[PDB]
Amino acid sequence: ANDAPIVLLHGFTGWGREEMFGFKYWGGVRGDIEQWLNDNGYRTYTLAVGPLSSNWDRACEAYAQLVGGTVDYGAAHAAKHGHARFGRTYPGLLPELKRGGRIHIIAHSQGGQTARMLVSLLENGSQEEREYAKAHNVSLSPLFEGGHHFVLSVTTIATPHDGTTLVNMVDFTDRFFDLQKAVLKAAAVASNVPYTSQVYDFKLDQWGLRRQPGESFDQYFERLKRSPVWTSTDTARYDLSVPGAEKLNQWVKASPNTYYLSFATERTYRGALTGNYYPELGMNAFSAVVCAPFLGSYRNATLGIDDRWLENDGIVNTFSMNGPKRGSTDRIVPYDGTIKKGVWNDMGTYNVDHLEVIGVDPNPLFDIRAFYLRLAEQLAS
Ligand SMILES: [Ca+2]
Ligand SMILES: [Zn+2]
């Protein structure tokens, strides 16, 4: 049926094609997924947006990168949260978008919540931003007007649509920055070295946070921990939690003019005596040692977290991935050989871990190339 190019969108880790000395978030140690899709004749682009920023801030950045222009976070939103209204300036990867072009988004991890929110803003705008604009006589980003539907279909991989319990870990703060550290390591990048090039830009202009000359990432992360991008409600950290994801689900709905596709991942085995889930062999070392124990055993009746939630891919509960449920009116149906419009098409669950699926961690039985080509083909169908 269609011609749409594909835009790749990372999660709460992630970086541009030139960052990390060319080590690709999409493809990691296996290769360059964008290159493969392009070689195969599927036109593909990569967005880079603040890994730790809220989905709102991320969707605003994404809008700017796509159509070109200066990031506008909304004057009501920036006033409420205490950060800059305008951010950086982009050329635009897809100027055709201005004349009725369309796209497909392939989104990993938190990128899936962002892709959802982008769609919902494009279609509906923000009532709150429209009113704050009229009321204080300031300018409004066209992102907030509504009526701008240009995303034809959204595909999510290992997305915490309902939040992930990782956030409830007692040392979640130190362990989450340890993961940024791990993803760094997998790119042959030290955390105790004060690099002179950017390497990994967290894109915190709006918070006025930037890494300093002679500052290592270890040192940078300590500061980040104490900044509003870790401690405010306007953070990846918040939209990632269970209550945070459910809040997003209350206003971020499936558009009827988009097709939605979900892929779940798992890398655990159930223990028969405990009913706990444990990391399979070959699961990435950091999630194996640090995150998966906790994820496979944390229950919390007040949060409605029971045995359903224990299966996981090393970072996100598997139950969370098939589509938003908590606080949502979206429909989820299992893939029947056809992609239905306006609902979540549950493409099933793959025995792959969170970082193996984008190839950041090796997995020789996972045929990452055929995986992505099949996705590309399905989107074109
Ligand atoms: Ca592995
Ligand atoms: Zn913000």
Main features:
Rossmann fold, binds zinc ion, binds calcium ion, alpha/beta, globular, seven-stranded parallel beta sheet
What does this structure look like?
Keywords: Calcium, Hydrolase, Lipid degradation, Lipid metabolism, Metal-binding, Secreted, Signal, Zinc. This is triacylglycerol lipase. One of its GO terms (cellular component) is extracellular region. Helix 2 packs across helix 4 (111-124). The protein is 31% helix and 14% strand. By secondary structure, the chain is an alpha/beta fold. It has helices at residues 33-39, 55-67, 75-81, 111-124, 127-136, 172-186, 217-225, 228-231, 236-240, 242-251, 285-297, 368-380; strands at residues 6-9, 44-47, 69-72, 86-90, 103-108, 151-157, 259-265, 268-270, 277-279, 332-334, 344-350. It has one domain (1-381): Alpha/Beta hydrolase fold, catalytic domain (Rossmann fold). The longest helix has 15 residues, at 172-186. The protein contains 12 helices and 11 strands. The chain starts with 5 loop residues before the first strand and ends with a helix. Bound molecules: calcium ion and zinc ion (ZN). Calcium ion binds next to loops.
